[PDB]
Amino acid sequence: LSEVSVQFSQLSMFPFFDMAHYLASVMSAREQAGALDIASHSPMASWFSAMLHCFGGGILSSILLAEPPVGILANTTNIMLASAIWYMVYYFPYDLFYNCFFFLPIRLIAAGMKEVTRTWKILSGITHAHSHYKDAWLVMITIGWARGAGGGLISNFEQLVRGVWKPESNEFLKMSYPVKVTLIGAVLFTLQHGHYLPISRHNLMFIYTMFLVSIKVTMMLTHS
Amino acid sequence: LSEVSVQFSQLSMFPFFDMAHYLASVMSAREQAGALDIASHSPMASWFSAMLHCFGGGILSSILLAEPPVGILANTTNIMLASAIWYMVYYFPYDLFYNCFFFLPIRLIAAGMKEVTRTWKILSGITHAHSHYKDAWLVMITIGWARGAGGGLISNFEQLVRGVWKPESNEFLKMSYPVKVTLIGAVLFTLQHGHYLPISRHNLMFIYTMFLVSIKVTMMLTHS
Amino acid sequence: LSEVSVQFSQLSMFPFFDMAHYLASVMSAREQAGALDIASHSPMASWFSAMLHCFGGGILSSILLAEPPVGILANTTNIMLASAIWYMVYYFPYDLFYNCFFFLPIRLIAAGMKEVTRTWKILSGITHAHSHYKDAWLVMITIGWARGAGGGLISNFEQLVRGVWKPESNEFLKMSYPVKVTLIGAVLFTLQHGHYLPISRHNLMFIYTMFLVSIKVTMMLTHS
């Protein structure tokens, strides 16, 4: 039944899903070590650290392609759309926001939707790298991977933003789960655009997104 | 009497004022902790650290706009115009140069003129960001702010140049005086170009520059 | 006998010499402190650290010229041509590869050929900077120098890649031999393109390359 994947390929991420990626990235940034004191004593650094979690893919993909990073800041609808989620995650009255989204089902849904945004980020970087370089495979892998897990690769300098400098925890030394999954996805969809992978783009899209959401849901259910 | 602000708006900064910004930035860089030993044992690193103080605004504004930083190095008149001030600040015979410019009135004048260069740097970044992005407010704030206090934002990596690595003293954690003032100015003049601020550009220019020079003069008089 | 330098100027570096630069840079990267454990426990970080040794000149010259660094990754023939040398330097059976190229004559030849690649990298950066900026001397010096010893200038962040963070060993504080030699060469050939240096390009090319190869050969013979 390939008629369902065609329906899945018509999804738009502007209203609902972008807020889900921003919310999962901002909450996951808050749950990190010493992130509450940053927002309590330096809202600027915590806000910028949140933006590195939300728009790290576009930032790294722009720096790697010699594209202006401030171009990501031009979309005031997305920047404000993430900054509101930041201010509600940290400075909501009685912390009613976080306590609402820390609930297990809501957290599962939000995270699972961020996993969906990751896909269109990977393909966006692959097709964009194709717009800059025709049949260059490594470029498409690098930019699609850069949009898939951008915040995870700038995680060292992002740590440097909040104030923690860990020169030992490099992403290449020990590849984390989301970064390595974004590598596998970038390679796969790069083989898809190059037609080296015998499957249509929509079906590979759907099966990859499902294989990601199922894994993260299993991780969050087995962690609690 | 708005006829005086029109006369103030016709100022040119190529001869006198650029040397004032370079001199205040180089002297303020020398007065930092452990900067004399750098120039005494490694003139290259002290020179580059001085260039990060002088041309940090153009460097950061160029990196943020995907513009070549080496483009700032093309203007050999400005680069030499600052390098001469560096070599005279550090390696002048009997230190007759620094001891002359460390005098309170001369230091007040030079610093106060650097405060004037900061304004045209902010507006240069705002109008330049307008040339790259029409009515994008955050871009104009970011580039005007990037030219206002560029050396203050690269101050971490600039510290890394001389040899001191302080991951705890981030500019976003504790915003210093010049950086936060450049933020306020970038926001104000950005509202001016967008015509959200009910005042002409020249008058806002003059009152902002005066409000800056008066504050720094008061700081230098109350510090000694 | 200027007829021999004309024959030397017709050299092509695509097959033999590029592999020599990649091999000397990868081997010299392995001989660094704690580089074997990186390749034994994290092949990704050791591979990227090797690419920073091989393509550091193009990377830094691309970042300084606002050119996409991923553009260096487009040439899959060169990237694979270096990655094969990396995998053979580290993971060859019985370490038969390294033990073969660590032999004194073979090491002398490979290093001496890397010294030859350095020249065409310097001139490539100088003529490229001329394509971006006509008669800007400092730009040509900066880009030619950036291609001459690129890995030596990113050596701090390259150290940060493997996991060692040394904020005290800056290249400007103590200029190493290859970096300072690349500075002298960039200045000389920049004076050549500007015709301030009374010598033809080919003769200066040959005498500079010889003056480099002789020095490195003398160093490797006096070190063992």
Pick from A147, B44, B177, A86: nearest CA to C174: B44
Q: Contacts of residue A82 in chain B, CB cutoff 8 Å?
A: none
The beta-carbon neighbor of C168 closest among B71, B79, B163 is: B163
Q: Coil, strand, or helix at residue A66?
A: coil
* CA–CA gap between residue A52 and residue A38 (Å, rounded): 15
Contact C161 A143 (CB under 8 A): no
Q: Enter the tokens of residue A54.
A: 């939300």
Q: What does the block give as tokens for A152?
A: 């995870």
Overall resolution, Å: 3.7
CA-angle at B214, arms to B212 and B215, nearest 5° = 65
Chain C residues lying within 8 Å of A137, measured CB to CB:
76
Residue at token pair 């400092």: C138
CA distance B55 to B73: 9
> What is chain C's alpha carbon radius of gyration, rounded to the nearest angstrom?
17
Interface test with C, best of B47, B70, B77 (most C CBs within 10 A): B70
Residue type, A120: W
Closest-CA residue to B100 (of B89, B86, B113)? B89
Q: How was this structure determined?
A: X-ray
Angle at A165 between CA A160 and CA A171, to 5 degrees: 85
- Judging contacts by C-beta atoms under 8 Å, the chain C residues touching residue A65 are 68, 70
Question: Which chains pack against C, by 3+ Cβ pairs within 8 A?
Answer: A, B
Closest CA to B112 of B181, B20, B202, B223: B20
SS (H, E, C) B20-33: HHHHHHHHHHHCCC
CA distance C146 to C68: 15
Q: For A180, which residue in chain C has the nearest alpha carbon?
A: C44
Closest partner CB to B167 (pick from A45, A62, A163)? A163
Give the C-alpha separation, B178 to B175, whole Å: 8
Measured distance between the N- and C-terminal CA atoms of chain C, rounded to whole angstroms: 35
In this complex, the chains that touch A, judged by 3 or more CB pairs closer than 8 A, are B, C
Nearest-by-CA chain B residue for C63: B68
Cα–Cα dist A174/A171, whole Å: 6
Which helix (H) or strand (E) segment holds residue B139: the answer is helix B137-148
DSSP state of B93: G
Q: Measured between alpha carbons, how far is B48 from B79 in angstroms, rounded to an integer?
A: 11
DSSP characters over C107-135: HHHHHHHHHHHHHHHHHHHHHHHHHHSSS
Instruction: Select from A178, A199, A177, A179 the least CA-distant residue to A188.
Output: A199
**What sign does the CA torsion over B100, B102, B103, B108 have?**
positive
B166 → chain C, closest CA residue? C167
Chain A: residue whose CA lies nearest to C74: A136
CA distance B148 to B212: 12
Sort residue C12 into left (φ over 0), alpha (ψ -120 to 50) or beta.
Answer: beta
Report helix, strand or coil for A107: helix
Contacts of B175 in chain A (CB under 8 A): 44
Provide CB contacts within 8 A for C211, sequence distance 6+. Answer: none
Distance CA A150, CA A118 (A): 10
Rounded CA gap, C215 and C222, in Å?
A: 10
Is B170 in Cβ contact with A161 (below 8 Å)? yes
For residue A197, give the amino acid letter.
L
Q: Show the CA angle centred on residue A132, arms to residues A153 and A170, nearest 5°.
A: 10
Please enumerate, by residue number, every residue of A annotated as part of a binding site.
Answer: 114, 118
Question: How far lies A89's CA from each of A22, A51, A219, in Å?
Answer: 11, 13, 23
Cα–Cα distance measured from residue A134 to residue A122, given in angstroms and rounded to the nearest whole number: 17
Six-digit token string for C137: 């001397």
User: Using the beta-carbon criterion (under 8 Å), do C48 and A175 form an inter-chain contact?
Assistant: no
Taking chain A, what is the end-to-end CA distance rounded to the nearest angstrom? 35
B23-36 burial, b at 16+ Cβ within 10 Å, e below that, comes to bbbbbbbbebeebe
CB contacts < 8 A (A, B): 57
Q: Which of C104, C185, C181 is nearest to C144 (CA)?
A: C185
- What is the residue whose two structure tokens read 């002359």? B100
Residue B169: closest C-alpha in chain A:
A163
Cα Rg of chain A (Å, integer): 17
Residues of A within 8 A of C74 (CB-CB) are 133, 136, 138-139
Give the position of tokens 């260069």.
Answer: B117
Q: Is C114 assigned to a binding site?
A: yes
DSSP label at residue A154: S
d(CA A165, CA A174): 17
Residues belonging to chain B with any Cβ–Cβ distance to chain A shorter than 8 Å = 64-66, 129, 132-133, 136-139, 142-143, 156, 165, 167-168, 170, 172-175
Q: Exposed/middle/buried for B180, CB within 10 Å: 0-12, 13-18, 19+?
A: middle
Question: DSSP character for B98?
Answer: H
